Write an enzyme that holds these catalytic residues in place. Structure first.
Site, PDB file in Angstrom:
ATOM      1  N   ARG A   1       0.122   9.270   1.056  1.00  0.00           N
ATOM      2  CA  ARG A   1      -0.662   9.295   2.299  1.00  0.00           C
ATOM      3  C   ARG A   1      -0.081   8.365   3.401  1.00  0.00           C
ATOM      4  O   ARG A   1      -0.445   8.465   4.578  1.00  0.00           O
ATOM      5  CB  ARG A   1      -2.108   8.908   2.008  1.00  0.00           C
ATOM      6  CG  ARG A   1      -2.228   7.496   1.506  1.00  0.00           C
ATOM      7  CD  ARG A   1      -3.670   7.030   1.322  1.00  0.00           C
ATOM      8  NE  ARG A   1      -3.662   5.700   0.722  1.00  0.00           N
ATOM      9  CZ  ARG A   1      -3.546   5.481  -0.583  1.00  0.00           C
ATOM     10  NH1 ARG A   1      -3.462   6.508  -1.417  1.00  0.00           N
ATOM     11  NH2 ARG A   1      -3.521   4.240  -1.052  1.00  0.00           N
ATOM     12  N   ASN A   2       0.820   7.463   3.020  1.00  0.00           N
ATOM     13  CA  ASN A   2       1.428   6.551   3.989  1.00  0.00           C
ATOM     14  C   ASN A   2       2.874   6.937   4.309  1.00  0.00           C
ATOM     15  O   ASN A   2       3.633   6.134   4.846  1.00  0.00           O
ATOM     16  CB  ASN A   2       1.376   5.109   3.473  1.00  0.00           C
ATOM     17  CG  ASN A   2       0.094   4.407   3.847  1.00  0.00           C
ATOM     18  OD1 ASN A   2      -0.451   4.626   4.930  1.00  0.00           O
ATOM     19  ND2 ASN A   2      -0.410   3.564   2.946  1.00  0.00           N
TER      20      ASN A   2
ATOM     21  N   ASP B   1       2.390   2.662   7.418  1.00  0.00           N
ATOM     22  CA  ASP B   1       1.309   1.835   6.890  1.00  0.00           C
ATOM     23  C   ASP B   1       0.071   1.989   7.780  1.00  0.00           C
ATOM     24  O   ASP B   1      -0.130   1.219   8.730  1.00  0.00           O
ATOM     25  CB  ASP B   1       1.766   0.372   6.796  1.00  0.00           C
ATOM     26  CG  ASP B   1       0.764  -0.524   6.083  1.00  0.00           C
ATOM     27  OD1 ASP B   1      -0.121   0.001   5.372  1.00  0.00           O
ATOM     28  OD2 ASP B   1       0.870  -1.765   6.238  1.00  0.00           O
TER      29      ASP B   1
ATOM     30  N   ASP C   1       0.800  -1.236   0.000  1.00  0.00           N
ATOM     31  CA  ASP C   1       0.000   0.000   0.000  1.00  0.00           C
ATOM     32  C   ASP C   1       0.833   1.286   0.000  1.00  0.00           C
ATOM     33  O   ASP C   1       0.536   2.229   0.750  1.00  0.00           O
ATOM     34  CB  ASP C   1      -0.968   0.014   1.200  1.00  0.00           C
ATOM     35  CG  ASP C   1      -2.060   1.086   1.067  1.00  0.00           C
ATOM     36  OD1 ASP C   1      -2.196   1.676  -0.035  1.00  0.00           O
ATOM     37  OD2 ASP C   1      -2.785   1.346   2.060  1.00  0.00           O
TER      38      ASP C   1
HETATM   39  C1  LIG Z   1       2.774   4.085  15.763  1.00  0.00           C
HETATM   40  C2  LIG Z   1       3.050   2.877  14.930  1.00  0.00           C
HETATM   41  C3  LIG Z   1       3.750   1.819  15.539  1.00  0.00           C
HETATM   42  C4  LIG Z   1       4.092   0.668  14.840  1.00  0.00           C
HETATM   43  C5  LIG Z   1       3.751   0.516  13.482  1.00  0.00           C
HETATM   44  C6  LIG Z   1       3.061   1.549  12.891  1.00  0.00           C
HETATM   45  C7  LIG Z   1       2.690   2.734  13.579  1.00  0.00           C
HETATM   46  C8  LIG Z   1       1.932   3.636  12.643  1.00  0.00           C
HETATM   47  C9  LIG Z   1       0.456   3.797  13.085  1.00  0.00           C
HETATM   48  C10 LIG Z   1      -0.317   4.844  12.210  1.00  0.00           C
HETATM   49  N1  LIG Z   1       0.462   6.080  12.289  1.00  0.00           N
HETATM   50  C11 LIG Z   1      -0.046   7.258  12.861  1.00  0.00           C
HETATM   51  O1  LIG Z   1      -1.250   7.298  13.137  1.00  0.00           O
HETATM   52  C12 LIG Z   1       0.786   8.494  13.036  1.00  0.00           C
HETATM   53  C13 LIG Z   1       0.201   9.702  12.620  1.00  0.00           C
HETATM   54  C14 LIG Z   1       0.866  10.889  12.691  1.00  0.00           C
HETATM   55  C15 LIG Z   1       2.168  10.863  13.201  1.00  0.00           C
HETATM   56  N2  LIG Z   1       3.110  11.877  13.363  1.00  0.00           N
HETATM   57  N3  LIG Z   1       4.268  11.378  13.886  1.00  0.00           N
HETATM   58  C16 LIG Z   1       4.093  10.051  14.064  1.00  0.00           C
HETATM   59  C17 LIG Z   1       2.784   9.660  13.651  1.00  0.00           C
HETATM   60  C18 LIG Z   1       2.085   8.454  13.585  1.00  0.00           C
HETATM   61  C19 LIG Z   1       1.788   5.954  11.632  1.00  0.00           C
HETATM   62  C20 LIG Z   1       2.650   4.980  12.465  1.00  0.00           C
HETATM   63  C21 LIG Z   1       1.985   2.850  11.314  1.00  0.00           C
HETATM   64  O2  LIG Z   1       1.568   3.137  10.203  1.00  0.00           O
HETATM   65  N4  LIG Z   1       2.638   1.626  11.555  1.00  0.00           N
HETATM   66  C22 LIG Z   1       2.862   0.610  10.564  1.00  0.00           C
HETATM   67  C23 LIG Z   1       4.243   0.746   9.938  1.00  0.00           C
HETATM   68  O3  LIG Z   1       4.898   1.782   9.945  1.00  0.00           O
HETATM   69  N5  LIG Z   1       4.723  -0.393   9.318  1.00  0.00           N
HETATM   70  C24 LIG Z   1       6.029  -0.325   8.723  1.00  0.00           C
HETATM   71  C25 LIG Z   1       5.950  -0.311   7.163  1.00  0.00           C
HETATM   72  F1  LIG Z   1       5.336   0.761   6.680  1.00  0.00           F
HETATM   73  F2  LIG Z   1       7.168  -0.315   6.607  1.00  0.00           F
HETATM   74  F3  LIG Z   1       5.268  -1.334   6.634  1.00  0.00           F
END
Ligand SMILES: Cc1cccc2c1C1(CCN(C(=O)c3ccc4[nH]ncc4c3)CC1)C(=O)N2CC(=O)NCC(F)(F)F
Length: 307
Positions: free
Chosen positions: A165-166, A179, A161
């Site tokens: 936006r990600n 993600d 994905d």
């Molecule tokens: C917080 C958190 C913890 C663990 C995983 C994840 C997260 C998240 C939760 C969703 N998320 C947020 O809501 C968010 C919003 C605004 C923000 N400003 N500063 C930090 C922050 C965080 C992003 C971070 C995530 O998307 N993942 C999944 C991942 O990053 N996977 C890794 C890959 F993309 F490579 F596949």
């Protein structure tokens, strides 16, 4: 690489703001009190003196089913493996008691889509009189995305994905790939029910993902082609914005049929021709003809700056 065996001190996390939602529960913005004690047990916090240390916490629902609980710990293990400057990194966890927690850096500037929308390209005084971004910096943003995906490919890790936006923005235009899942109201229009299957981000999907469901690194390259387009449009428009979702799905059929009826994203004005041709190869019909992330990154960091 294994998941951490000792938890982060839960009592050090002080709540500030909600950052988001999901089926798992919530993501909170927290302050870490007296962070200079904890870096001594790293937990490699980037404590910059004279500044409060803020941190994003993904928290499991207190009412979570056993299976969602299982899935949450599966993700802890996945995240534990991901160690790269351009990928969201796990700072610590809290899992030896409830609620389950994953902790990551705070990126001051939120997602890359909303960040670019707020910027004007530099030389173009079609301003709001208002933040600007240079073309070299646009490229630098794109190069970082390429480098992160290159790292993920060395792990045989398929994102499925990728889109602006990600992506999150920190200081000095630094980028990290995340993600979020697909629950954010803001991007509901980027996802559509594919028949006999799931709700998916069709406008970023390779034809073999839409027709058959085959996701691979090569489909990640295709999604990066679309993501690079986004960046060079400064996120003013959705990919294939003229087409209905049903038309997007039909267009995948035309890629497969390969008879000249398909349509491609056009060249953004900010995109030089040489970079557009590399972009086009990302959307090749045959997977093996799509460029490796290594090539994409090298062109963005070198050749695209002068052409
Ligand atoms: C917080 C958190 C913890 C663990 C995983 C994840 C997260 C998240 C939760 C969703 N998320 C947020 O809501 C968010 C919003 C605004 C923000 N400003 N500063 C930090 C922050 C965080 C992003 C971070 C995530 O998307 N993942 C999944 C991942 O990053 N996977 C890794 C890959 F993309 F490579 F596949």
């Amino acid at each position: 690489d294994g998941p951490p065996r000792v938890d982060f001190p839960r009592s050090r996390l002080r709540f500030k703001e909600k950052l988001g939602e999901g089926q798992f529960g919530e993501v909170h913005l927290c302050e870490v009190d007296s962070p200079q004690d904890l870096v001594s047990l790293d937990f490699p916090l980037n404590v910059r003196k004279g500044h409060p240390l803020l941190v994003a916490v993904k928290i499991l629902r207190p009412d979570a089913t056993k299976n969602a609980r299982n899935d949450f710990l599966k993700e802890v293990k996945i995240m534990s493996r991901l160690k790269d400057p351009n990928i969201i990194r796990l700072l610590g966890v809290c899992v030896q008691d409830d609620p389950l927690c994953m902790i990551t850096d705070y990126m001051e500037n939120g997602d890359l889509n909303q960040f670019l929308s707020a910027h004007q390209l530099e030389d173009k005084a079609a301003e709001g009189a208002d933040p600007t971004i240079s073309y070299p910096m646009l490229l630098h943003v794109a190069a970082q995305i390429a480098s992160g995906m290159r790292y993920l490919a060395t792990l045989n890790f398929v994102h499925r994905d990728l889109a602006t936006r990600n992506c999150l923005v920190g200081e000095n235009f630094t980028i990290k790939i995340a993600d979020f899942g697909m629950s954010r109201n803001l991007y509901a229009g980027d996802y559509y029910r594919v028949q006999g299957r799931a709700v998916l981000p069709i406008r970023w999907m390779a034809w073999e993902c839409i027709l058959m469901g085959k996701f691979t690194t090569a489909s990640d390259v295709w999604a990066f082609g679309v993501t690079l387009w986004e960046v060079l449009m400064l996120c003013r428009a959705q990919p294939f914005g003229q087409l209905t979702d049903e038309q997007v799905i039909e267009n995948a059929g035309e890629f497969f049929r390969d008879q000249g009826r398909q349509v491609y994203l056009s060249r953004p004005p900010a995109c030089p021709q040489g970079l557009y041709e590399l972009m086009l190869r990302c959307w090749s019909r045959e997977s093996e003809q799509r460029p490796p992330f290594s090539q994409l990154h090298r062109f963005l960091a070198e050749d695209a700056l002068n052409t």
